[PDB]
Amino acid sequence: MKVAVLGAAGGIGQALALLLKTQLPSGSELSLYDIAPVTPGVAVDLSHIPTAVKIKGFSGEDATPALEGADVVLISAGVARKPGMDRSDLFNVNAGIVKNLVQQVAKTCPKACIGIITNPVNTTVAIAAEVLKKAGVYDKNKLFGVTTLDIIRSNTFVAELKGKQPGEVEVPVIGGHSGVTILPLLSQVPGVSFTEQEVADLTKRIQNAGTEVVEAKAGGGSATLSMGQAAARFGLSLVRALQGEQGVVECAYVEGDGQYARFFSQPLLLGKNGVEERKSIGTLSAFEQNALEGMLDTLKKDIALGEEFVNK
Amino acid sequence: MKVAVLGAAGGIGQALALLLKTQLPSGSELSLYDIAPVTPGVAVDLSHIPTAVKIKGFSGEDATPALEGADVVLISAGVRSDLFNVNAGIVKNLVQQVAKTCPKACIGIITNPVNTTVAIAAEVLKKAGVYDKNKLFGVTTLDIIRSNTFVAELKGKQPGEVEVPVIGGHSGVTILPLLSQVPGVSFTEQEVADLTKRIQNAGTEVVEAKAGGGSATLSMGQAAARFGLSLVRALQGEQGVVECAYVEGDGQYARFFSQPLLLGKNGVEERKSIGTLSAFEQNALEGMLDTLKKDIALGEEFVN
Numbered sequence: 001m002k003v004a005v006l007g008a009a010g011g012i013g014q015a016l017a018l019l020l021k022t023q024l025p026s027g028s029e030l031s032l033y034d035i036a037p038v039t040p041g042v043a044v045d046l047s048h049i050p051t052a053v054k055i056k057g058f059s060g061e062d063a064t065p066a067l068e069g070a071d072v073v074l075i076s077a078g079v080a081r082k083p084g085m086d087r088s089d090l091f092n093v094n095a096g097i098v099k100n101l102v103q104q105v106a107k108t109c110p111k112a113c114i115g116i117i118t119n120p121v122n123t124t125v126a127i128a129a130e131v132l133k134k135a136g137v138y139d140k141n142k143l144f145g146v147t148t149l150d151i152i153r154s155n156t157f158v159a160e161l162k163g164k165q166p167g168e169v170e171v172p173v174i175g176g177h178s179g180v181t182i183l184p185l186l187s188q189v190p191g192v193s194f195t196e197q198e199v200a201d202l203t204k205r206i207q208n209a210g211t212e213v214v215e216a217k218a219g220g221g222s223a224t225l226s227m228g229q230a231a232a233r234f235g236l237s238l239v240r241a242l243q244g245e246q247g248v249v250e251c252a253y254v255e256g257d258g259q260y261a262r263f264f265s266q267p268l269l270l271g272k273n274g275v276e277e278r279k280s281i282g283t284l285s286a287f288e289q290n291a292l293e294g295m296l297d298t299l300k301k302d303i304a305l306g307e308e309f310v311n312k
Numbered sequence: 313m314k315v316a317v318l319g320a321a322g323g324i325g326q327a328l329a330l331l332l333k334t335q336l337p338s339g340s341e342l343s344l345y346d347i348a349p350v351t352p353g354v355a356v357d358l359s360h361i362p363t364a365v366k367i368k369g370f371s372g373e374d375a376t377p378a379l380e381g382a383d384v385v386l387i388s389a390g391v392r393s394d395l396f397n398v399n400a401g402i403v404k405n406l407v408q409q410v411a412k413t414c415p416k417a418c419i420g421i422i423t424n425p426v427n428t429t430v431a432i433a434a435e436v437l438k439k440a441g442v443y444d445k446n447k448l449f450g451v452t453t454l455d456i457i458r459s460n461t462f463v464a465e466l467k468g469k470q471p472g473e474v475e476v477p478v479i480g481g482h483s484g485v486t487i488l489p490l491l492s493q494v495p496g497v498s499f500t501e502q503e504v505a506d507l508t509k510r511i512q513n514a515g516t517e518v519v520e521a522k523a524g525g526g527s528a529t530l531s532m533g534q535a536a537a538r539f540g541l542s543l544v545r546a547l548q549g550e551q552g553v554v555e556c557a558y559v560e561g562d563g564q565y566a567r568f569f570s571q572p573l574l575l576g577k578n579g580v581e582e583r584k585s586i587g588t589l590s591a592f593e594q595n596a597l598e599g600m601l602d603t604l605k606k607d608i609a610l611g612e613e614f615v616n
Contacts, residue, residue: 038525050471166362217353
């Protein structure tokens, strides 16, 4: 299988590429692409690690050589924080980058599975889908918003609270990937219960966890290493499914049946063609039902913004 | 076991901390230190990964809180004559903090130029009265993993199964891959000269391909993680853990010299023979001695 990382020179992209060079199955190929001129040197640095994963890097404006033959494209390009740029400015920069890179995908490797890491995922996945539909190549089973950082953060905070081994906790997290749209289903964690205060407190922590890192970095950066790790979990899961492994399940933000919104994160069985089955969210507690209903207005507006970005 | 990374905010340090957060044994502790103000948040970013390694990060001038109870300290801190002096002074400072807070730790020096910075570390520890030659290592593992990669590619081998001993020092002609000792593979004279040149210049290869954006960081993080995980395995009592590293040994060639080491509960358990060298390797070893000895002297003079 061949994986392309678009945005490979950034902090997320370098962490993701290091993890993929060391954990992709033997005989995989990895390409790195970013406008930054350092990118071929990022790939040469990684090529010195003795795993059976061939790696090459590419720069300039044209991602084609990285995309040729790609089975999975992970798009982590964009900016989290830049001097002088406020939320709207960052959104327009990231939206523009996603629109450009997904158009390159649609041209070169339109049958690849695509994982959008670039934030804000609630909107950038809708931009990606609109670009793909315009190209006439959209497959709703092959476009994912990578929401895995919310899952691994939830696993960490629940294992700390509940006195569990961190690698043994798995929290389902549904909805979207920002603020009140992130819905950790603490009611479905087996073996334990939470008080209403613990649910409110953990949900708030999970929904604001990105700030927690910005703050400790004295405003000097944002979550990059954990995002790299989260993206590698999702990329390696998709690779295993694409190679034929069965029973691989991950939550991700995908276009679904529209019960709640056009795009929605829910547990997915993955298979050889991307999503194999969109699994039910299961039973919700009263707090979860209310938080779900409460955020749908916001999530639907996020989605609409991506649609309107691509045309206007 | 507790591992401290000093220089954690840098490219090497962040890559190394990511690998250690995910690969240290359950129940381990990892502390990150760097004067960069970002450091405490580099640890918070990593603390969101759900593995049973507790992580904390520290900034400011005092590495004490990171070094308390540390069993292994990996020093990747740094950043032509002014560049050397800055990096030398950073190693001299950090090794002095190690000598004060965790003098019984195993110390891996990653900061370049290793051939010289290990000598600076040794003289600092000697001046503090806590120098243990079994516990101070120059981390040369990047040369080993590069040699493995390049041999595996040339000879069509599984790269994870190839293990090339590399001896000498960690820069240019002082890097000596013992290609003659790789089981199940044979090399022409041309291949030996070409592989040796590529290994010796691999650091430049990366710098060149990075076009201004710096040197090897991600593969150096992997190399240092391999070496630090081997030290932890040995400290915990695992048998048969062998790694090449630059250490103060018998002085047959130079005061410090990288050779295969059996690791154990107290750092080096045994310094192993370099074994039989081919004629090409013997002439490469003889040819590097004056350079290596000058590198060592530069570090000694820097402290003394």
